Amino acid sequence: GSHMKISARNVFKGTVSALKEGAVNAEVDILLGGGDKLAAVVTLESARSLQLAAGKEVVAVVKAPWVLLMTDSSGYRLSARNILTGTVKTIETGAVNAEVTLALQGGTEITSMVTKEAVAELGLKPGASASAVIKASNVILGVP
Amino acid sequence: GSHMKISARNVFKGTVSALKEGAVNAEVDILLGGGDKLAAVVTLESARSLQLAAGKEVVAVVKAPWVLLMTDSSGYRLSARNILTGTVKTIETGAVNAEVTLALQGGTEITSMVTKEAVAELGLKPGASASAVIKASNVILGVP
Amino acid sequence: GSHMKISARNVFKGTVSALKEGAVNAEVDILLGGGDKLAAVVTLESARSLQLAAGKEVVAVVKAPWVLLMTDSSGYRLSARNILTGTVKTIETGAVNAEVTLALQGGTEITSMVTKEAVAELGLKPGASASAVIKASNVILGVP
């Protein structure tokens, strides 16, 4: 009971910087510790029931397998709302998968589960630049 | 052809207890075998084309990597619609991942794929209480 | 910078064959190389900002863990928009997971990450027929 204990490798505390409610869903923009911004999309019902408002503290939860890693966009613009650039800090290889941890500017760490082939193909290595790509619809929000 | 054969570790048969259609999506509340309830969100087009209605039998499909495990909410309320409490029945550890199976009250079993670090950090062990957290948008529905 | 380098095992180039915008989201129908069709659902804001239009070239990105495999629908109709039938080309087993690659008619290959139990239960083997099941909401789009 000292914290929330959840399996997700990424659990970030932040404050809502903007709340944009439409008739079906609500986009919640969150300012995390390091200055990193993350967007989450939740249902209108959740935005009302969780009592979301700009300035309120929230937790954003993202499972590792939901994070994609990108090293070269090659000019492409993507539909996913969150493209967080950082540097590779840790890689731990498994049998077919691997866990990659990136440090974002400001210090936040984000962890992604990708195939060991992707680590190979992307040329990941401690210090290498990469972006974590996360759809806002794959971010779960929590409110104290 | 004796059943539906799909990779998902979780395939549950149930009856629709409530159908709530909006102009874009439809929330389908499903009563599963053990008395467990699961919510799914599908498009309006799917609710019309599948002929959904309260009282009709459906199958809900959830891939293992889409299920988060939580042991202590610490007072937090989450945006995900499904928080199913149960007890740990089986854990099988892999290289970087692990498969955890929970028994819910009533008997339904739910299987989650998490990192082996999460199993360690959460202190999971046969008999330990935990909740499976599943967004309703990550439940696929099937109709005979 | 010769291509987009992203971890996703499935990155397909295609042309938009239909764009259907509603007040919240937009369904984008994509004709891939082999003649295979894939549907993606993106936000209205993304459809406007990416300048989507029928006839324009796009890339569709799907992470391996987001693809389900099905061998026998047994008559069931599912809520997921993409059901792509193909033949198994490659399986590589890990510790608890496995990577399965299917060849679709026309030549496109799709890769799925499933549990090694699912490979066993489905009786997958090179040449076996199977369908990749992908929600349209789990397809990320990119535009040059």
Tab-separated table of C-alpha atoms in Angstrom:
chain	number	residue	atom	x	y	z
A	1	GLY	CA	0.000	0.000	0.000
A	2	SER	CA	3.083	2.245	-0.182
A	3	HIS	CA	2.555	2.589	-3.914
A	4	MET	CA	0.414	1.029	-6.765
A	5	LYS	CA	1.918	-2.333	-7.645
A	6	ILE	CA	1.172	-3.138	-11.325
A	7	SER	CA	2.987	-5.319	-13.843
A	8	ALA	CA	3.442	-2.546	-16.382
A	9	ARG	CA	7.064	-1.662	-16.869
A	10	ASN	CA	6.140	1.978	-17.351
A	11	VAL	CA	4.236	3.820	-14.622
A	12	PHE	CA	4.680	7.603	-14.703
A	13	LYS	CA	3.366	10.254	-12.331
A	14	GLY	CA	2.551	13.636	-13.811
A	15	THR	CA	0.132	16.503	-13.869
A	16	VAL	CA	-2.531	17.086	-16.500
A	17	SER	CA	-1.459	19.995	-18.713
A	18	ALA	CA	-4.534	19.880	-20.971
A	19	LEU	CA	-7.839	17.997	-21.062
A	20	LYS	CA	-9.674	17.910	-24.412
A	21	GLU	CA	-13.078	16.200	-24.219
A	22	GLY	CA	-15.107	15.403	-27.295
A	23	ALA	CA	-18.495	13.610	-27.315
A	24	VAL	CA	-16.994	10.106	-27.162
A	25	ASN	CA	-13.433	10.353	-25.887
A	26	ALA	CA	-11.078	12.683	-24.071
A	27	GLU	CA	-7.449	13.439	-24.814
A	28	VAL	CA	-5.411	13.977	-21.660
A	29	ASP	CA	-2.035	15.696	-22.019
A	30	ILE	CA	0.330	14.906	-19.134
A	31	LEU	CA	3.533	16.625	-18.136
A	32	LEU	CA	5.879	14.017	-16.637
A	33	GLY	CA	8.755	14.557	-14.189
A	34	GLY	CA	11.605	15.182	-16.619
A	35	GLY	CA	9.595	17.697	-18.682
A	36	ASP	CA	8.552	14.910	-21.038
A	37	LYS	CA	4.922	15.157	-22.258
A	38	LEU	CA	2.724	12.045	-22.833
A	39	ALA	CA	-0.782	12.006	-24.350
A	40	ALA	CA	-3.457	9.485	-23.267
A	41	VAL	CA	-6.959	8.949	-24.768
A	42	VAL	CA	-9.663	7.714	-22.413
A	43	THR	CA	-13.419	7.447	-22.713
A	44	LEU	CA	-15.615	10.436	-21.906
A	45	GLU	CA	-17.171	8.370	-19.153
A	46	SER	CA	-13.726	7.811	-17.591
A	47	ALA	CA	-12.809	11.491	-17.832
A	48	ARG	CA	-15.995	12.367	-15.947
A	49	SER	CA	-15.780	9.512	-13.422
A	50	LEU	CA	-12.049	10.020	-12.695
A	51	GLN	CA	-12.748	13.751	-12.229
A	52	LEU	CA	-10.020	14.717	-14.665
A	53	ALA	CA	-9.083	18.357	-14.898
A	54	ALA	CA	-6.066	20.316	-16.058
A	55	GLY	CA	-3.642	20.677	-13.133
A	56	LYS	CA	-4.563	17.416	-11.367
A	57	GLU	CA	-2.063	14.679	-10.638
A	58	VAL	CA	-2.423	11.380	-12.498
A	59	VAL	CA	-0.414	8.186	-13.180
A	60	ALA	CA	0.003	6.959	-16.800
A	61	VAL	CA	0.514	3.204	-17.254
A	62	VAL	CA	1.968	1.660	-20.438
A	63	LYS	CA	2.748	-2.061	-20.835
A	64	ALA	CA	6.178	-2.766	-22.389
A	65	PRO	CA	4.878	-4.669	-25.464
A	66	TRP	CA	2.748	-1.643	-26.370
A	67	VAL	CA	5.817	0.564	-27.027
A	68	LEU	CA	7.437	0.591	-30.472
A	69	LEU	CA	11.002	1.769	-30.967
A	70	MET	CA	12.023	3.898	-33.968
A	71	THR	CA	15.560	4.990	-34.926
A	72	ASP	CA	14.986	6.682	-38.316
A	73	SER	CA	11.664	8.149	-39.289
A	74	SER	CA	13.094	8.924	-42.721
A	75	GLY	CA	10.711	11.893	-43.002
A	76	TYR	CA	7.570	9.883	-42.192
A	77	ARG	CA	4.922	11.381	-39.920
A	78	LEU	CA	2.968	8.807	-37.905
A	79	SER	CA	-0.590	8.610	-36.607
A	80	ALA	CA	0.556	7.722	-33.095
A	81	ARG	CA	0.446	10.734	-30.782
A	82	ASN	CA	3.534	9.980	-28.649
A	83	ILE	CA	7.017	9.999	-30.204
A	84	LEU	CA	9.480	10.333	-27.289
A	85	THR	CA	13.138	10.682	-28.190
A	86	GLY	CA	15.826	9.310	-25.908
A	87	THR	CA	18.997	7.279	-25.648
A	88	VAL	CA	19.348	3.564	-25.078
A	89	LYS	CA	20.373	2.785	-21.508
A	90	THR	CA	19.795	-0.959	-21.070
A	91	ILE	CA	19.071	-3.993	-23.243
A	92	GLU	CA	18.409	-7.496	-21.874
A	93	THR	CA	17.959	-10.180	-24.489
A	94	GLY	CA	15.641	-13.130	-24.051
A	95	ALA	CA	14.983	-16.049	-26.403
A	96	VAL	CA	12.856	-14.379	-29.048
A	97	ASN	CA	12.161	-11.061	-27.274
A	98	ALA	CA	14.254	-8.391	-25.594
A	99	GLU	CA	13.622	-5.558	-23.147
A	100	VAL	CA	15.041	-2.165	-24.124
A	101	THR	CA	15.121	0.818	-21.746
A	102	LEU	CA	15.532	4.332	-23.036
A	103	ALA	CA	16.417	7.444	-21.053
A	104	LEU	CA	14.376	10.462	-22.219
A	105	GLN	CA	15.609	14.055	-21.863
A	106	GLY	CA	14.833	15.103	-18.291
A	107	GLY	CA	15.507	11.621	-16.948
A	108	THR	CA	12.304	9.607	-17.438
A	109	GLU	CA	13.047	5.987	-18.423
A	110	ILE	CA	10.748	4.130	-20.784
A	111	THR	CA	10.854	0.376	-21.315
A	112	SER	CA	9.862	-1.429	-24.517
A	113	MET	CA	9.575	-5.176	-25.278
A	114	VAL	CA	10.591	-5.868	-28.884
A	115	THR	CA	11.807	-8.943	-30.807
A	116	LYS	CA	15.499	-9.722	-30.622
A	117	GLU	CA	15.513	-9.337	-34.438
A	118	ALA	CA	14.361	-5.704	-34.100
A	119	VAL	CA	17.243	-4.970	-31.685
A	120	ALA	CA	19.622	-6.424	-34.259
A	121	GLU	CA	18.108	-4.644	-37.289
A	122	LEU	CA	17.895	-1.262	-35.532
A	123	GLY	CA	21.517	-1.525	-34.380
A	124	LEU	CA	20.567	-0.716	-30.807
A	125	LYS	CA	23.387	-0.306	-28.327
A	126	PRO	CA	23.849	1.722	-25.155
A	127	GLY	CA	23.987	5.410	-26.224
A	128	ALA	CA	22.175	4.994	-29.566
A	129	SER	CA	19.390	7.455	-30.221
A	130	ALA	CA	15.870	6.090	-30.557
A	131	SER	CA	12.272	7.180	-30.120
A	132	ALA	CA	9.570	5.317	-28.215
A	133	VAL	CA	6.343	5.420	-30.244
A	134	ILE	CA	3.182	4.992	-28.180
A	135	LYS	CA	-0.446	5.376	-29.297
A	136	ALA	CA	-2.359	7.598	-26.851
A	137	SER	CA	-5.118	4.979	-26.810
A	138	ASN	CA	-2.600	2.491	-25.277
A	139	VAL	CA	-2.009	4.612	-22.173
A	140	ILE	CA	-4.113	3.731	-19.130
A	141	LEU	CA	-4.643	6.486	-16.598
A	142	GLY	CA	-4.981	6.243	-12.867
A	143	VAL	CA	-6.143	8.847	-10.323
A	144	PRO	CA	-5.500	8.869	-6.645
B	1	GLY	CA	-14.596	-27.249	-36.594
B	2	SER	CA	-15.524	-28.522	-33.116
B	3	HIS	CA	-14.677	-25.118	-31.695
B	4	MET	CA	-12.981	-21.787	-32.778
B	5	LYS	CA	-9.234	-22.331	-32.769
B	6	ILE	CA	-7.464	-18.996	-32.064
B	7	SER	CA	-4.078	-18.215	-30.542
B	8	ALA	CA	-5.477	-16.025	-27.787
B	9	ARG	CA	-4.928	-17.522	-24.381
B	10	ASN	CA	-8.254	-16.144	-23.209
B	11	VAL	CA	-11.444	-17.093	-25.050
B	12	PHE	CA	-14.603	-16.786	-22.941
B	13	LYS	CA	-18.190	-17.665	-23.797
B	14	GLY	CA	-20.903	-15.561	-22.213
B	15	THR	CA	-24.176	-13.803	-22.733
B	16	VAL	CA	-24.609	-10.087	-23.335
B	17	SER	CA	-26.045	-8.489	-20.190
B	18	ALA	CA	-26.127	-4.941	-21.595
B	19	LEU	CA	-25.491	-3.274	-24.956
B	20	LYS	CA	-24.817	0.486	-24.906
B	21	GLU	CA	-24.465	1.998	-28.391
B	22	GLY	CA	-23.325	5.549	-28.939
B	23	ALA	CA	-22.820	7.215	-32.353
B	24	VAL	CA	-19.314	5.805	-32.873
B	25	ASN	CA	-18.846	2.813	-30.595
B	26	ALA	CA	-20.786	0.313	-28.531
B	27	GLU	CA	-20.033	-0.994	-25.064
B	28	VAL	CA	-20.970	-4.647	-24.663
B	29	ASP	CA	-21.279	-6.005	-21.121
B	30	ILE	CA	-20.849	-9.791	-20.957
B	31	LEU	CA	-21.693	-12.168	-18.155
B	32	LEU	CA	-19.180	-15.037	-18.217
B	33	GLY	CA	-19.603	-18.576	-16.856
B	34	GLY	CA	-18.386	-18.081	-13.293
B	35	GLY	CA	-20.511	-14.946	-12.762
B	36	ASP	CA	-17.561	-12.790	-13.786
B	37	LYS	CA	-18.504	-9.740	-15.916
B	38	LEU	CA	-16.264	-8.448	-18.772
B	39	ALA	CA	-16.811	-5.260	-20.806
B	40	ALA	CA	-15.828	-4.990	-24.499
B	41	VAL	CA	-15.943	-1.881	-26.764
B	42	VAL	CA	-16.550	-2.474	-30.461
B	43	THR	CA	-17.405	-0.177	-33.335
B	44	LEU	CA	-21.019	0.764	-34.014
B	45	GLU	CA	-20.670	-0.901	-37.387
B	46	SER	CA	-19.632	-4.168	-35.695
B	47	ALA	CA	-22.492	-4.006	-33.198
B	48	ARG	CA	-24.943	-3.674	-36.088
B	49	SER	CA	-23.254	-6.236	-38.360
B	50	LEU	CA	-22.768	-8.839	-35.585
B	51	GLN	CA	-26.438	-8.354	-34.623
B	52	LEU	CA	-25.558	-7.742	-30.995
B	53	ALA	CA	-28.380	-7.602	-28.503
B	54	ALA	CA	-28.733	-8.072	-24.770
B	55	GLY	CA	-29.310	-11.775	-24.051
B	56	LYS	CA	-27.358	-13.134	-27.041
B	57	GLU	CA	-24.411	-15.474	-26.700
B	58	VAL	CA	-20.967	-14.170	-27.655
B	59	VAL	CA	-17.276	-15.135	-27.268
B	60	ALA	CA	-14.786	-12.549	-25.890
B	61	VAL	CA	-11.160	-12.943	-27.014
B	62	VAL	CA	-8.215	-11.332	-25.179
B	63	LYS	CA	-4.552	-11.917	-26.106
B	64	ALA	CA	-2.291	-12.635	-23.098
B	65	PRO	CA	0.054	-9.631	-23.593
B	66	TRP	CA	-2.967	-7.315	-23.439
B	67	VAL	CA	-3.697	-8.195	-19.776
B	68	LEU	CA	-1.989	-6.259	-16.978
B	69	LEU	CA	-1.715	-7.681	-13.478
B	70	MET	CA	-2.204	-5.508	-10.377
B	71	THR	CA	-1.698	-6.543	-6.730
B	72	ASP	CA	-2.174	-3.221	-4.880
B	73	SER	CA	-4.179	-0.388	-6.326
B	74	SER	CA	-3.193	1.737	-3.337
B	75	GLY	CA	-6.465	3.673	-3.683
B	76	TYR	CA	-5.984	4.492	-7.379
B	77	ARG	CA	-8.948	4.289	-9.744
B	78	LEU	CA	-8.018	3.385	-13.325
B	79	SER	CA	-9.436	4.270	-16.730
B	80	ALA	CA	-9.529	0.632	-17.827
B	81	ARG	CA	-13.031	-0.820	-17.567
B	82	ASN	CA	-12.136	-4.384	-16.494
B	83	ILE	CA	-10.494	-5.037	-13.114
B	84	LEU	CA	-11.032	-8.757	-12.372
B	85	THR	CA	-9.855	-10.002	-8.999
B	86	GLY	CA	-8.597	-13.546	-8.583
B	87	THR	CA	-5.892	-15.781	-7.192
B	88	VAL	CA	-2.713	-16.922	-8.878
B	89	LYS	CA	-2.962	-20.525	-10.045
B	90	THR	CA	-0.006	-21.046	-12.399
B	91	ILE	CA	3.199	-19.249	-13.372
B	92	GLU	CA	5.587	-20.456	-16.097
B	93	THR	CA	8.727	-18.404	-16.501
B	94	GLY	CA	10.429	-17.856	-19.829
B	95	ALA	CA	13.618	-15.933	-20.619
B	96	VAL	CA	12.404	-12.364	-20.305
B	97	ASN	CA	8.638	-13.009	-20.114
B	98	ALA	CA	6.362	-15.208	-18.035
B	99	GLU	CA	2.805	-16.504	-18.318
B	100	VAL	CA	0.618	-16.053	-15.237
B	101	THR	CA	-2.821	-17.667	-14.874
B	102	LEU	CA	-5.326	-16.383	-12.372
B	103	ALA	CA	-8.481	-18.103	-11.154
B	104	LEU	CA	-11.375	-15.624	-10.819
B	105	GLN	CA	-14.268	-16.139	-8.386
B	106	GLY	CA	-16.698	-18.509	-10.101
B	107	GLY	CA	-13.895	-20.435	-11.778
B	108	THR	CA	-12.970	-18.513	-14.942
B	109	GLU	CA	-9.201	-18.582	-15.588
B	110	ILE	CA	-7.467	-15.605	-17.148
B	111	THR	CA	-3.943	-15.710	-18.548
B	112	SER	CA	-1.542	-12.760	-18.704
B	113	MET	CA	1.931	-12.457	-20.299
B	114	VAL	CA	4.137	-10.146	-18.222
B	115	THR	CA	7.908	-9.637	-17.836
B	116	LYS	CA	9.705	-11.939	-15.438
B	117	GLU	CA	10.718	-8.761	-13.544
B	118	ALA	CA	7.036	-7.932	-12.918
B	119	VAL	CA	6.456	-11.422	-11.447
B	120	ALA	CA	9.401	-10.815	-9.134
B	121	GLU	CA	8.423	-7.255	-8.127
B	122	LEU	CA	4.760	-8.145	-7.528
B	123	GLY	CA	5.738	-11.137	-5.381
B	124	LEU	CA	3.463	-13.442	-7.338
B	125	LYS	CA	3.125	-16.992	-6.093
B	126	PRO	CA	0.369	-19.595	-6.230
B	127	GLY	CA	-2.454	-18.318	-3.956
B	128	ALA	CA	-1.486	-14.620	-4.044
B	129	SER	CA	-4.308	-12.219	-4.764
B	130	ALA	CA	-4.110	-10.164	-7.943
B	131	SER	CA	-6.369	-8.386	-10.404
B	132	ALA	CA	-6.263	-8.691	-14.185
B	133	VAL	CA	-6.666	-5.219	-15.710
B	134	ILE	CA	-8.025	-5.216	-19.258
B	135	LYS	CA	-9.126	-2.234	-21.369
B	136	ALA	CA	-12.553	-2.897	-22.917
B	137	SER	CA	-11.143	-1.736	-26.253
B	138	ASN	CA	-8.693	-4.714	-26.144
B	139	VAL	CA	-11.466	-7.319	-26.107
B	140	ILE	CA	-12.436	-8.765	-29.488
B	141	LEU	CA	-15.922	-10.197	-29.767
B	142	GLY	CA	-17.133	-13.107	-31.807
B	143	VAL	CA	-20.692	-14.217	-32.645
B	144	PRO	CA	-21.805	-17.594	-33.787
C	1	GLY	CA	17.641	7.420	-43.914
C	2	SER	CA	17.237	4.913	-46.766
C	3	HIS	CA	14.011	3.714	-45.192
C	4	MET	CA	12.004	4.090	-41.880
C	5	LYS	CA	13.673	1.932	-39.254
C	6	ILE	CA	11.055	0.800	-36.683
C	7	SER	CA	10.910	-2.230	-34.405
C	8	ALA	CA	7.565	-3.436	-35.709
C	9	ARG	CA	7.854	-6.732	-37.496
C	10	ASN	CA	5.168	-5.671	-39.946
C	11	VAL	CA	5.637	-2.510	-42.008
C	12	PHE	CA	3.616	-2.450	-45.237
C	13	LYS	CA	3.548	0.132	-48.013
C	14	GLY	CA	0.274	0.607	-49.842
C	15	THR	CA	-2.133	3.077	-51.319
C	16	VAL	CA	-5.327	4.290	-49.681
C	17	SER	CA	-8.300	2.709	-51.460
C	18	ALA	CA	-10.952	4.365	-49.270
C	19	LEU	CA	-11.029	6.988	-46.515
C	20	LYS	CA	-14.140	7.057	-44.298
C	21	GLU	CA	-14.127	9.920	-41.777
C	22	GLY	CA	-16.695	10.194	-39.031
C	23	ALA	CA	-16.795	12.934	-36.352
C	24	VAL	CA	-14.253	11.233	-34.071
C	25	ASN	CA	-12.276	8.717	-36.100
C	26	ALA	CA	-11.424	7.776	-39.659
C	27	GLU	CA	-11.258	4.341	-41.229
C	28	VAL	CA	-8.484	4.062	-43.801
C	29	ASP	CA	-8.638	1.148	-46.245
C	30	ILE	CA	-5.229	0.287	-47.721
C	31	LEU	CA	-4.396	-1.853	-50.711
C	32	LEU	CA	-1.049	-3.565	-50.066
C	33	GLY	CA	1.449	-4.905	-52.620
C	34	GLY	CA	0.144	-8.444	-53.053
C	35	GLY	CA	-3.479	-7.297	-53.487
C	36	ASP	CA	-4.074	-7.817	-49.775
C	37	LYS	CA	-6.305	-5.150	-48.151
C	38	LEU	CA	-5.720	-3.881	-44.560
C	39	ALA	CA	-7.981	-1.496	-42.612
C	40	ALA	CA	-6.602	1.028	-40.081
C	41	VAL	CA	-8.574	3.353	-37.733
C	42	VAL	CA	-6.941	6.651	-36.817
C	43	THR	CA	-8.220	9.784	-35.137
C	44	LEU	CA	-9.959	12.469	-37.179
C	45	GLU	CA	-7.193	14.833	-36.164
C	46	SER	CA	-4.585	12.446	-37.619
C	47	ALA	CA	-6.521	12.002	-40.859
C	48	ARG	CA	-6.573	15.780	-41.297
C	49	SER	CA	-2.980	16.380	-40.157
C	50	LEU	CA	-1.515	13.496	-42.216
C	51	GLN	CA	-3.451	14.805	-45.244
C	52	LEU	CA	-4.989	11.414	-45.911
C	53	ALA	CA	-6.890	10.950	-49.129
C	54	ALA	CA	-7.907	8.018	-51.285
C	55	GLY	CA	-5.088	7.272	-53.746
C	56	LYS	CA	-2.215	8.470	-51.531
C	57	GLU	CA	0.662	6.252	-50.490
C	58	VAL	CA	0.950	5.293	-46.820
C	59	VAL	CA	2.838	2.802	-44.599
C	60	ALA	CA	0.871	0.620	-42.119
C	61	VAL	CA	2.769	-0.520	-39.010
C	62	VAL	CA	1.644	-3.455	-36.831
C	63	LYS	CA	3.653	-4.802	-33.870
C	64	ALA	CA	3.943	-8.621	-33.807
C	65	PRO	CA	2.222	-9.130	-30.409
C	66	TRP	CA	-0.832	-7.282	-31.739
C	67	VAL	CA	-1.583	-9.999	-34.341
C	68	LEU	CA	-3.730	-12.997	-33.394
C	69	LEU	CA	-3.627	-16.209	-35.400
C	70	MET	CA	-6.789	-18.207	-36.168
C	71	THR	CA	-7.005	-21.617	-37.885
C	72	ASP	CA	-10.731	-22.446	-37.556
C	73	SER	CA	-13.352	-19.780	-37.154
C	74	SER	CA	-15.963	-22.510	-36.760
C	75	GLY	CA	-18.586	-20.160	-38.233
C	76	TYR	CA	-17.849	-17.285	-35.835
C	77	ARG	CA	-17.780	-13.722	-37.148
C	78	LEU	CA	-15.425	-11.412	-35.245
C	79	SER	CA	-15.452	-7.713	-34.406
C	80	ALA	CA	-11.895	-7.228	-35.652
C	81	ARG	CA	-11.826	-5.685	-39.123
C	82	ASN	CA	-8.784	-7.521	-40.548
C	83	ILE	CA	-8.879	-11.295	-41.097
C	84	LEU	CA	-6.040	-12.083	-43.546
C	85	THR	CA	-5.761	-15.670	-44.720
C	86	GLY	CA	-2.389	-17.166	-45.562
C	87	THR	CA	-0.051	-20.098	-45.129
C	88	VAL	CA	2.561	-20.624	-42.455
C	89	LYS	CA	6.062	-19.990	-43.774
C	90	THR	CA	8.294	-19.764	-40.689
C	91	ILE	CA	8.078	-20.512	-36.968
C	92	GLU	CA	10.862	-19.754	-34.467
C	93	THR	CA	10.200	-20.900	-30.934
C	94	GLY	CA	11.435	-19.040	-27.887
C	95	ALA	CA	11.039	-19.913	-24.203
C	96	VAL	CA	7.402	-19.039	-23.643
C	97	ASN	CA	6.702	-17.188	-26.917
C	98	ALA	CA	7.177	-17.916	-30.602
C	99	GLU	CA	7.283	-15.876	-33.801
C	100	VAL	CA	5.102	-17.135	-36.653
C	101	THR	CA	5.298	-15.732	-40.197
C	102	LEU	CA	2.487	-16.233	-42.653
C	103	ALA	CA	2.565	-15.703	-46.409
C	104	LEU	CA	-0.657	-14.054	-47.648
C	105	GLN	CA	-1.984	-14.513	-51.194
C	106	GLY	CA	-0.069	-12.060	-53.379
C	107	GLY	CA	3.111	-12.486	-51.357
C	108	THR	CA	2.832	-10.151	-48.352
C	109	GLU	CA	4.321	-11.722	-45.199
C	110	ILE	CA	2.805	-11.019	-41.805
C	111	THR	CA	4.515	-11.839	-38.520
C	112	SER	CA	2.740	-12.664	-35.255
C	113	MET	CA	4.144	-13.242	-31.733
C	114	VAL	CA	2.081	-15.876	-29.910
C	115	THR	CA	2.698	-18.222	-26.953
C	116	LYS	CA	4.450	-21.485	-27.699
C	117	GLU	CA	1.309	-23.195	-26.313
C	118	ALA	CA	-0.816	-21.559	-29.042
C	119	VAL	CA	1.551	-22.895	-31.743
C	120	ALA	CA	1.139	-26.353	-30.237
C	121	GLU	CA	-2.660	-26.179	-29.810
C	122	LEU	CA	-3.255	-24.752	-33.300
C	123	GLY	CA	-1.070	-27.445	-34.878
C	124	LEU	CA	0.923	-24.870	-36.806
C	125	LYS	CA	3.499	-26.162	-39.247
C	126	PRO	CA	4.959	-24.854	-42.496
C	127	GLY	CA	2.133	-24.991	-45.097
C	128	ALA	CA	-0.780	-24.981	-42.620
C	129	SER	CA	-3.537	-22.514	-43.367
C	130	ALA	CA	-4.160	-19.747	-40.853
C	131	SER	CA	-5.575	-16.242	-40.673
C	132	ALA	CA	-3.939	-13.233	-39.040
C	133	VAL	CA	-6.583	-11.310	-37.079
C	134	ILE	CA	-5.767	-7.639	-36.534
C	135	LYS	CA	-7.995	-4.910	-35.070
C	136	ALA	CA	-7.958	-1.821	-37.314
C	137	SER	CA	-7.352	0.287	-34.207
C	138	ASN	CA	-3.991	-1.545	-33.737
C	139	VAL	CA	-2.596	-0.372	-37.077
C	140	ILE	CA	-0.439	2.759	-36.972
C	141	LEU	CA	-0.192	4.740	-40.180
C	142	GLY	CA	2.702	6.714	-41.530
C	143	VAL	CA	2.841	9.235	-44.398
C	144	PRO	CA	5.860	10.357	-46.289
